[PDB]
């Protein structure tokens, strides 16, 4: 397939097909990668880069997907920076929506609990990554720490779990009562039926499922 992206020669953006009416320059044994977020072709230079750390990143250290923020910087609505360190991820301003098992009654516990405070996601991130780097808080990809270069989803999916340690943390005493006078639901955090509003409201997420006694 013919392409042409930011960084391509002239001769080539001239040469393509014509539409129909009612520092870097691209080499020609280069390729081009298709960013994950934006769609668009950029130089791929990630083979290039495991011998040249002074090449941006081009690729989540996580999923392995390429992203071209650092690279050039992306654009897109819904884009917030789809490529970055971790502790620097701009994870969006809607971030703690349904950050608690994609539970909003959970999640705007913890939302009412950090403005109380004058708390933001980020007061909270960076709290979490401290917890996570003495090995207090852990996560599911265990090898990602506040200086892995990662993408939006896979930094999401990492905030969520820095997120529910968090909450656990907190002491029952520094919620209001409404919320720790709900009974711990049997099934635990995992529970299905939270996307509910009546059982998301009476029982407890923040535990672990029941198992014996
Ligand atoms: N319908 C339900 N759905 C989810 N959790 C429930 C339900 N009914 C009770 N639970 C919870 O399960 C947990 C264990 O309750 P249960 O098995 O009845 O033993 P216990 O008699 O010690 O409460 C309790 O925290 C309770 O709040
Ligand atoms: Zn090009
Ligand atoms: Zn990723
Ligand atoms: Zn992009
Ligand atoms: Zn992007
Ligand atoms: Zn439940």
């Given at each position: 397939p013919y392409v042409v992206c930011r960084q391509c020669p002239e001769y080539r953006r001239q040469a393509a097909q014509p539409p129909h009416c009612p520092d870097y320059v691209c080499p020609l044994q280069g390729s081009h990668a298709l960013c994950t977020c934006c769609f668009q072709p950029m130089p791929d230079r990630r083979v290039e880069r495991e011998?040249?750390?002074?090449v941006a990143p081009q690729?989540?250290?996580?999923?392995?997907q390429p992203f071209c923020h650092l690279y050039w910087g992306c654009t897109r609505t819904?884009?917030?920076?789809?490529?970055?360190?971790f502790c620097e991820?701009?994870?969006?301003?809607?971030?703690?929506?349904?950050?608690?098992?994609?539970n909003s009654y959970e999640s705007d516990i913890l939302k009412n609990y950090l403005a109380t405070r004058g708390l933001t996601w980020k007061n909270m991130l960076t709290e979490s990554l401290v917890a996570l780097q003495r090995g207090v808080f852990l996560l599911?990809?265990?090898?990602?720490?506040?200086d892995t270069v990662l993408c939006y989803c896979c930094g999401l999916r990492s905030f969520r779990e820095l997120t529910y340690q968090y909450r656990q943390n907190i002491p029952a005493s520094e919620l209001p009562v409404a919320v720790t006078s709900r009974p711990d639901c049997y099934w635990g955090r995992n529970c299905r039926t939270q996307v509910k509003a009546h059982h998301a409201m009476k029982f407890n997420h923040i535990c672990e499922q029941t198992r014996f006694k």
């Amino acid at each position: 397939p013919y392409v042409v992206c930011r960084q391509c020669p002239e001769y080539r953006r001239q040469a393509a097909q014509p539409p129909h009416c009612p520092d870097y320059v691209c080499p020609l044994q280069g390729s081009h990668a298709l960013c994950t977020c934006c769609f668009q072709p950029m130089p791929d230079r990630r083979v290039e880069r495991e011998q040249d750390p002074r090449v941006a990143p081009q690729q989540c250290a996580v999923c392995l997907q390429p992203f071209c923020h650092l690279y050039w910087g992306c654009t897109r609505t819904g884009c917030y920076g789809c490529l970055a360190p971790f502790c620097e991820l701009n994870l969006g301003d809607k971030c703690l929506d349904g950050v608690l098992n994609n539970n909003s009654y959970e999640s705007d516990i913890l939302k009412n609990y950090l403005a109380t405070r004058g708390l933001t996601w980020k007061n909270m991130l960076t709290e979490s990554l401290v917890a996570l780097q003495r090995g207090v808080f852990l996560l599911s990809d265990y090898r990602v720490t506040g200086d892995t270069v990662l993408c939006y989803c896979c930094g999401l999916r990492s905030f969520r779990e820095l997120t529910y340690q968090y909450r656990q943390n907190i002491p029952a005493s520094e919620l209001p009562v409404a919320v720790t006078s709900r009974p711990d639901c049997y099934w635990g955090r995992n529970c299905r039926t939270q996307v509910k509003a009546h059982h998301a409201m009476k029982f407890n997420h923040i535990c672990e499922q029941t198992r014996f006694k």
